Design a protein around this ligand. Structure first.
Ligand code: SF4
Ligand code: ZN
Ligand code: ZN
Lengths: 714, 149, 98
């Protein structure tokens, strides 16, 4: 299926493409032709990737010099795995059409914890443990000690790779994460490092954002080699939140206590080192005079000199001073305090800690900590986090803020205060990506209106188009129910949350909806507490019991272990005729991680507009700052924070293969024009005024009729 | 306030945390309810150590680590010396080099005898007091006032 | 299972069939029904559900895996059409033997 695109001729594996795909490809080519960063939205969870992937490959062949390589990032490793399958299928189709192999390479990176071949690290599953363990095995001292070939466990896979992988690069091919593990075992090399080296010569590389956003690890693999590369983020509508998480560092009393305990070991280790090995390890000072990874981006990072901290004893006391200030600064009991620039000034004045020596604190820690030949960095990890916080605060505070919470939420009195350093604007951390790469395409699904994103992220978009899915059949039939059988407003307002009648309407709607909806249904609430209150209220009445009779009911909890088991059972219920009703929270990691397909989550039910609690002070600095800078109204962003979040948790049912499904939002607020406009175009255009505010009884009847139409074949 | 209590009278801290640590040349935890215990007898003598104090050697501090008290207090006095700004030296190395000795002096003063440091500090006094100490000392208020606003 | 027991002993030449008129989408069964499907295919018993007001998932695999056809009632008039269609003998497939 070779497509004669306006720009050029493009191959395509599947037989047919819907009109939206034509609009998608042409718009994508326009941005590529303009060589300018831009954003676009595509409804389908699947189908965009092949269209997105295919167009880039064709563009590469036509203008190989224009684009060095493609960097396609996905939210989660389970999700990114599905992408390589799409790419692998495409290459075979293209290879068959060409009839011979071509110099094209595609590989996916992942954390050493996910993929590794050393038996010792296999049983452990914690991410830090593998990094700490792997560092020890690959430590230069072990490498230097490995040369001596002394009796000591040495990890051969890295050693064999160095002798072999360095000389010969892999010719070409597509290697999945699971597949790439096999290759390492056979060749006695790292599936991780082998992929790491291949980034120098690789047409397509795919990894999650935290491999490309956090300056600590993104910078090393995202070096200037890809000066002009097509970096693409997929379903990255929650990019600001992840972009912010790359900068925010949380300091807690228990973490602080562990830092002091770890620091005590550091001093003890230094004393042992001096008596055992001093001259050889003292050589680090000489190079230091000349002049865990730094959190400072490319231009912000500085390497002039370490500063006044030139020796282990001097540096260790510096951490003691800074740690004490944080310890005391945190212990203060008072209202939440914000002090982005003043904290640095207060830190300098109170304890005599100049910012410039504090700038290199984290950078000096990595070098100094290396000299100690520590067993692993997992034990001392809490100290590094503070060190990263130590350097970050001294680096910049123009678009940042330190938030101190002597009292935690949900607890009238708790002796575990937490100090927050939450960012406020995502443009700061993502600036290098836009600046370094010639063009970035933020392809997303369920994207709330694009106009806000350039305001949030400082970039000049080239194209701003919304693509509406078009099919011979109406796969999706969304509706909004605001009026109950009592013709009573059903908005899930904070003041209206406690109303029993509104809660009664939600239960009755679910009972009737569960009666007609076939097996597989998911209901999303606005918060765990609100979900529990509604669940308890239904439990007291007979509504909850009847729902149990009609269909099985499953609920979500904060603990991941219970969530996985409950969802695992939920899938089986959908396969069988029992059905299931999975109650969950919109912010729940399950909602974002999970994907619903045919006969899974058939009817997505949204109980109340998803709004975060208006008391979390972290959002305020993030929120009120956006009003001051970029000029976004608090309500506008607050509502935008809901429609994007609501659209995220309701756009799953249309994953792919044209599997029917109806999305019902049990809240009259969605009927408001402002909510409808911010809703994604593809969902909104299907929505009509006739079904905009159907009553609970009225909404059920149309749902029954719509399912009948989709039941019959094409 | 998170400390269990005074080494001798560990009762007031449990009742209330209002008491604050008092710094001394002993670099040595003390509490207000226990400060009065020192004034009645000795009048400036550490209970266990017996370190003499000129006039009670008492100043309010809120750092539970005794070493930090001496290190911070010593650093305050040292900052009065070697306060010349970095730009005064064009040499790249000389920027932070002198700070290294400053840090060495602080650590040298904390534990080792200060006689060498005091003798050394006298040598710097004869030279720095003329121009740099007076100039930077006056400019401290100017920069601080501008920085505060 | 009840149909299987009586149809298990039926002659091989005759084409056993089942037409489940499913009304309530739920299916509470003592044992997992997917296992029973394996038996049906070996027993070559054709099961062609006619669902009502619901496109039940489990019967979807039941019809296609077992060889039968799945349908949902569009309305009463369409209901007459469906059953009358099943009146005619179904074509014999490869698994079918004469
Ligand atoms: S060096 Fe390679 S094989 Fe050894 S622990 Fe690290 S990732 Fe695993
Ligand atoms: Zn006392
Ligand atoms: Zn004492």
């Amino acid at each position: 299926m070779k497509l004669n695109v306006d720009g050029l001729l493009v191959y395509f594996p599947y037989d047919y493409i819907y009109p939206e795909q034509f609009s998608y490809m042409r718009e994508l080519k326009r941005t590529l032709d303009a060589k300018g960063h831009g954003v676009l939205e595509m409804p389908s969870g699947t189908g965009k990737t092949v269209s997105l992937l295919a167009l880039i490959m064709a563009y590469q062949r036509a203008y190989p010099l224009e684009v060095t390589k493609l960097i396609y990032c996905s939210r989660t490793v389970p999700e990114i795995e599905k992408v390589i399958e799409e790419l692998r299928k495409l290459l075979n189709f293209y290879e068959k059409q060409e009839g011979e192999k071509l110099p094209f390479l595609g590989l996916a990176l992942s954390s050493r914890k996910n993929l590794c071949i050393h038996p010792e690290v296999t049983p452990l599953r914690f991410g830090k443990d593998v990094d700490g363990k792997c560092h020890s095995l690959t430590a230069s001292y072990v490498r230097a000690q490995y040369q001596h070939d002394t009796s000591l466990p040495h990890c051969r896979f890295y050693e064999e790779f160095d002798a072999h992988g360095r000389e010969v690069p892999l010719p070409a091919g597509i290697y999945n994460l699971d597949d790439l593990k096999a290759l390492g075992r056979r060749q006695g090399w790292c599936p991780y490092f082998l992929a790491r080296y291949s980034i120098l010569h690789a047409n397509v590389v795919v990894y999650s954002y935290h491999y490309l956003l956090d300056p600590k690890i993104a910078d090393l693999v995202s070096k200037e080699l890809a000066r002009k590369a097509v970096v693409v983020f997929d379903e990255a509508h929650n990019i600001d939140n992840v972009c912010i998480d790359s900068m925010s560092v949380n300091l807690t009393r228990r973490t602080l206590d562990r830092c002091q305990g770890n620091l005590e070991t550091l001093q003890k280790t230094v004393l042992r080192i001096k008596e055992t090995d001093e001259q050889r390890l003292r050589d680090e000072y000489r190079r230091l005079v000349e002049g865990a990874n730094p959190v400072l981006p490319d231009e912000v990072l500085q390497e002039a000199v370490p500063g006044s901290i030139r020796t282990a004893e001097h540096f260790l006391g510096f951490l003691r001073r800074l740690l004490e200030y944080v310890k005391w600064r945190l212990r203060v009991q008072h209202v939440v305090q914000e002090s982005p620039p003043a904290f640095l000034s207060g830190l300098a004045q109170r304890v005599c800690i100049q910012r410039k020596p504090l700038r290199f604190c984290a950078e000096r820690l990595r070098s100094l900590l290396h000299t100690l030949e520590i067993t692993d960095l997992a034990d001392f990890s809490p100290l590094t986090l503070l060190a990263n916080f130590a350097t970050l605060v001294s680096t910049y505070a123009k678009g940042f803020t330190i938030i101190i919470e002597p009292f935690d939420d949900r607890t009238p009195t708790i002796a575990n205060p937490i100090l927050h350093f939450s960012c406020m604007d995502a443009s700061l951390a993502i600036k290098p990506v836009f600046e370094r790469f010639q063009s970035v395409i933020i392809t997303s699904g369920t994207l709330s209106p694009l106009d806000i994103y350039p305001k949030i992220l400082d970039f000049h978009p080239v194209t701003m188009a919304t693509f509406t899915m078009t099919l011979a059949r109406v796969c999706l039939c969304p509706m909004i129910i605001g009026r109950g059988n009592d013709q009573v407003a059903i908005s899930s307002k904070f003041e209206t949350r406690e109303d029993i009648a509104v809660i009664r309407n939600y239960g009755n709607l679910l009972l009737e909806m569960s009666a007609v909806v076939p097996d597989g249904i998911v209901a999303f609430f606005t918060s765990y507490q609100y979900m529990e209150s509604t669940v308890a209220s239904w439990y007291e009445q007979g509504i909850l019991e009847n729902i149990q009779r009609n269909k099985l009911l499953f609920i979500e909890t904060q603990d991941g272990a219970e969530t996985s088991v409950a969802l695992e059972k939920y899938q089986e219920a959908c396969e069988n005729g029992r059905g299931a009703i999975l109650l969950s929270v919109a912010r729940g990691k399950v909602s974002e991680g999970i994907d619903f397909v045919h006969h899974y989550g058939r009817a997505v039910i949204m109980f109340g507009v998803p709004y975060v609690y208006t008391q979390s002070r972290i959002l305020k600095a993030r929120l009120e700052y956006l009003r001051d800078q970029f000029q976004i109204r608090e309500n506008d962003f607050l509502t935008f924070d809901a429609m994007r979040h609501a659209a995220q948790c309701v756009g799953r049912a249309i994953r792919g293969k044209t599997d029917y499904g109806l999305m019902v939002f049990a809240d009259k607020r969605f009927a408001r024009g402002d909510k409808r406009g911010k809703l994604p175009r593809w969902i909104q255009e299907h929505l009509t005024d006739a079904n905009l505010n159907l009553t609970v009884d009225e909404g059920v009847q149309v749902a029954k009729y719509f399912l009948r139409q989709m039941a019959q074949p094409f | 306030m998170d400390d269990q209590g005074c080494p001798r009278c560990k009762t007031t801290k449990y009742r209330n945390p209002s008491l604050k640590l008092m710094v001394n040349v002993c670099g040595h935890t003390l509490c207000e309810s226990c400060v009065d215990l020192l004034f009645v007898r000795g009048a400036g003598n550490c209970p266990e150590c017996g370190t003499p104090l000129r006039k009670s050697n008492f100043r309010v501090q809120l750092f539970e680590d005794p070493t930090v008290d001496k290190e911070v207090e010593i650093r305050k006095k040292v900052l009065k010396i070697y306060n010349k700004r970095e730009e005064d030296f064009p040499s790249l190395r000389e920027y932070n080099d002198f700070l290294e000795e400053v840090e060495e002096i602080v650590f040298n003063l904390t534990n080792n005898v200060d006689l060498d440091n005091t003798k050394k500090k006298m040598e710097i006094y004869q030279k720095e007091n003329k121009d740099v100490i007076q100039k930077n000392k006056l400019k401290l208020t100017r920069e601080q006032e501008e920085l505060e606003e | 299972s009840i149909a299987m027991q009586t149809l298990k002993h039926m002659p091989g030449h005759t084409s056993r069939e089942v037409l489940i008129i499913f009304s309530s989408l739920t299916t509470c069964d003592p044992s997992n029904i997917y296992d029973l499907i394996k038996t049906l295919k070996a027993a070559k018993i054709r099961v062609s559900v006619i669902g009502l007001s619901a496109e039940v998932r489990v019967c979807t695999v039941l019809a296609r895996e077992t060889g039968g056809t799945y349908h949902v009632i569009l309305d009463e008039s369409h209901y007459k059409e469906l059953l009358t269609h099943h009146v005619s003998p179904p074509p014999a497939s490869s698994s079918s033997e004469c």
